[PDB]
Amino acid sequence: SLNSTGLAQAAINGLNARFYESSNARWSSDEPWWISGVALTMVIEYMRRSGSKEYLDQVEDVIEVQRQPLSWWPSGEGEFRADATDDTGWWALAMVRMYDLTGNEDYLNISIKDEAYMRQWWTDTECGGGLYVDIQDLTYKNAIANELYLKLVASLANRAPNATIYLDRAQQAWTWFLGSGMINGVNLINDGLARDSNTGSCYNNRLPVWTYNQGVILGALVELYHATKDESYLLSAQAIADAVLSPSNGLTSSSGVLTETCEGSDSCNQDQQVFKGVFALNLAELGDAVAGASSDPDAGQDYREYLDTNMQSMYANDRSEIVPTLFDSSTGDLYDVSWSGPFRNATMPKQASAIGLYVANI
């Protein structure tokens, strides 16, 4: 059988061999900065679930350089405060995991600065609540910036000294999210909200169902469960996960493999290429919480088998190896976007997603 710890570490090595820039303490400067945050999350999570510390020095290097004032958003004053609330949220959650890994309060402090910064763009005066994604524009309240925020405040309610302010925020933010209409009639989440021209009212914009918008929300509800021990949060999460797993909604193929809506047309762009592994990692958080919350030994079995089915398909059909040479002895695995379709080329977002799936299985 497959060793998910072995393959996660081979995929991180492939990630580093092809995409890490030592001079920049970052992966692929030609790819979006927020996806370096996701990749960092994936490496941190590998180390947490497996018990290894073989990438801790590198992670520390990336954090030290990427927490500097960003050259494209100096008014954020660094600490990952960026020109979009979702970019900030990806790094904030990575600093929550770093804290979980190390116990070092410095990482939790960054997460707390990031929550206060994102909150600046929460308004109650449009859509009854939620935050904007686009800090310079203030035109779009979307699913992912609001899921990241919700998962951040819920995480802080379990970890921060002023825990009860964060719990109140997370409970409010979840009430808002649920009432927004982004969760649609099959319990899947569309891309965001549109605003009515004459009336100011907000409604589900019916833009695509992206896998990472079915995933970050599960981590948030898991943290809400841990903050309250109220199983209602796990029941909502399981309804959203069960909808992804259902072939009738088209995110799961007849072969059982998680499939981005853009794959069929070979049109997944640099953002969409990372989406699936973010879902996988969050589905593993939900599986762990469900199985822990009950005495049934089959509890969470369906999520565990789903992740395992996907891992076997991705390893068998989507994987490629770096050619070792007489000089560069580096060894790792490389991955394309489709967890079932063929390997044609690796990119850093595709690779980060692949590590996510393996770490979900550790």
Ligand X SMILES: OC[C@H]1O[C@H](O)[C@@H](O)[C@@H](O)[C@@H]1O
Confirm or reject binding of residue 33 to ligand X (CB under 6 A). Answer: yes
Q: Which of 16, 171, 205, 214 binds ligand X (CB under 6 A)?
A: 205
Instruction: Report, in Å, the least distance between residue 162 CB and ligand X.
Output: 30
Q: How far apart (Å, rounded) are the C-alpha atoms in residues 14 and 32?
A: 19
Instruction: Report, in Å, the least distance between residue 273 CB and ligand X.
Output: 10
Q: Which of 271, 288, 302, 308 binds ligand X (CB under 6 A)?
A: 271
Instruction: Report, in Å, the least distance between residue 183 CB and ligand X.
Output: 15
Q: How far apart (Å, rounded) are the C-alpha atoms in residues 289 and 229?
A: 11
Q: In 3D, which of 331, 303, 154 has the Cα closest to residue 238?
A: 303
Q: In 3D, which of 129, 162, 164, 126 has the Cα closest to residue 146?
A: 129
Contact 111, 156 (CB under 8 A): yes
Question: In the complex, which residue's CB is closest to ligand X?
Answer: 33
Q: Enter the tokens of residue 51.
A: 């018990």
Nearer to ligand X, 144 or 170 (CB): 144
Confirm or reject binding of residue 104 to ligand X (CB under 6 A). Answer: no
| Number of chain positions touching ligand X (CB under 6 A) | 16
Q: How far apart (Å, rounded) are the C-alpha atoms in residues 177 and 2?
A: 38
In the DSSP assignment, the letter for residue 248 is G
Instruction: Report, in Å, the least distance between residue 129 CB and ligand X.
Output: 16
Confirm or reject binding of residue 100 to ligand X (CB under 6 A). Answer: no
DSSP string, 15-35: HHHHHEETTTTEE-TTS-HHH
Confirm or reject binding of residue 210 to ligand X (CB under 6 A). Answer: yes
3-state helix, strand, coil in the chain (%, to 5): 55, 10, 35
Q: Choose the binding region for ligand X from 95-103, 138-146, 238-246, 333-341 (rule: CB under 6 A).
A: 138-146
Confirm or reject binding of residue 219 to ligand X (CB under 6 A). Answer: no
Nearer to ligand X, 133 or 241 (CB): 133
Tally of residues, the chain: 362
Nearer to ligand X, 47 or 63 (CB): 63
Nearer to ligand X, 56 or 140 (CB): 140
Nearer to ligand X, 144 or 251 (CB): 144
Instruction: Report, in Å, the least distance between residue 71 CB and ligand X.
Output: 7
DSSP string, 52-113: --TTHHHHHHHHHHHTS-BTTBGGG-STT--SBHHHHHHHHHHHHHHHHHH--HHHHHHHHH
Q: Choose the binding region for ligand X from 151-159, 175-183, 186-194, 303-311 (rule: CB under 6 A).
A: 186-194
Q: Choose the binding region for ligand X from 44-52, 134-142, 289-297, 339-347 (rule: CB under 6 A).
A: 134-142
The residue with tokens 């399981």 is 238
Instruction: Pick out residues in 303-362 that bind ligand X (CB under 6 A).
Output: none
**Per residue in 180-214, is it b (16+ CB within 10 Å) or e — as a string?**
bebbeeebbbbbbbbeeeeeeebebbeeebbbbbb
Confirm or reject binding of residue 126 to ligand X (CB under 6 A). Answer: no
Instruction: Report, in Å, the least distance between residue 33 CB and ligand X.
Output: 3
Q: In 3D, which of 352, 208, 226, 241 has the Cα closest to residue 307?
A: 241
Count of Cβ atoms closer than 10 Å to residue 113 Cβ: 19
Instruction: Pick out residues in 76-95 that bind ligand X (CB under 6 A).
Output: 83
Nearer to ligand X, 132 or 315 (CB): 132
Confirm or reject binding of residue 192 to ligand X (CB under 6 A). Answer: yes
Confirm or reject binding of residue 272 to ligand X (CB under 6 A). Answer: yes
Note the residues at the interface with ligand X (CB under 6 A). 32-33, 72, 83, 139-140, 142, 144, 191-194, 205, 210, 271-272
